[PDB]
User: Which sequence fits this backbone?
């Protein structure tokens, strides 16, 4: 009856909702519009860090990157204060995940190199994890701003969940690099009102949020039950019916997550 509960939420919040929870050895996949495209928004920043970690030695995290006031387009709670000093790759990774720093993300994209300011390379990285669906075509802040129907800068709940699974629970990264990504997501500052709000306090939650125009609000997480059983949870939403200025609804994500938690209990 989960489809019905998700549908009621869509009516309640005047929203479109997408949900995917991969199957486990003891549970069935949970899916709702899981194969419909939704804008990444900032959720791309998690696998972006993985991509950076993957293609370089650990010693790369200590490389100092320099930039200018011109460089920091979009929200950048961190980068604005380190213009003079620069920031290391590691510091950029930290900022990109835990504070969703757009300038940091753009710099990491640049570090991947290649056409589209790194977007092609990032997309290439996703392909290496078997994700043929997602694509990143623009940087911050434009990537949050594509019109409904545009395939650019989109993923699906299904696709992004399977990526996150490999990164955190699987062997996409070696243990040392895996721990770094896990730890940054664990100490995320931006997700308190979303999936975290839907899971009881005794469940551990690590996540990366995404927010955008057309009422776009996303969150991707790995959770662990009170007895340590992990699940991957991807929840995505937008409100295209309200046009560009439509307000994102955090509560929709928290409520959907609650529905999920009830099934996983």
Assistant:
């Amino acid at each position: 009856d989960l489809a019905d509960r998700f549908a009621e939420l869509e009516r309640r919040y005047d929203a479109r909702l997408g949900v995917y929870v991969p199957a486990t050895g003891t549970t069935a996949a949970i899916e709702y519009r899981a194969d419909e495209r939704f804008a990444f928004c900032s959720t791309f920043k998690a696998p972006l860090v993985a991509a950076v970690l993957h293609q370089n030695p650990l010693t790369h995290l200590d490389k100092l990157i320099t930039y200018t006031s011109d460089d920091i387009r979009s929200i950048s709670p961190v980068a604005q204060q380190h213009v003079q000093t620069g920031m290391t790759i590691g510091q950029l990774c930290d900022a990109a995940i835990r504070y969703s720093d757009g300038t940091a993300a753009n710099l990491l994209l640049a570090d991947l190199g290649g056409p589209g300011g790194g977007t092609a390379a990032f997309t290439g990285y996703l392909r290496s994890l078997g994700d043929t669906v997602s694509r990143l075509d623009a940087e911050a802040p434009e990537l949050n701003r594509d019109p409904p129907g545009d395939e650019r800068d989109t993923t699906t709940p299904h696709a992004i969940a399977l990526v996150l699974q490999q990164l955190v629970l699987g062997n996409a990264l070696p243990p040392d690099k895996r721990a770094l990504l896990t730890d940054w997501m664990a100490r995320n500052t931006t997700g308190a009102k979303r999936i975290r709000a839907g899971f009881p306090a005794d469940w551990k939650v690590i996540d990366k949020t995404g927010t955008g125009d057309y009422g776009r609000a996303n969150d991707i997480a790995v959770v662990w039950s009170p007895t340590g059983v992990p699940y991957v949870v991807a929840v995505m939403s937008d409100r295209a019916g309200g046009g560009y200025d439509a307000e994102p609804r955090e509560a929709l994500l928290a409520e959907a997550a609650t529905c999920v938690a009830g099934v996983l209990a």
About this structure: Residues 1-265 form a domain with the Beta-lactamase fold (CATH 3.40.710.10). The chain has one domain: 1-265. The two ends are 16 Å apart (CA to CA).
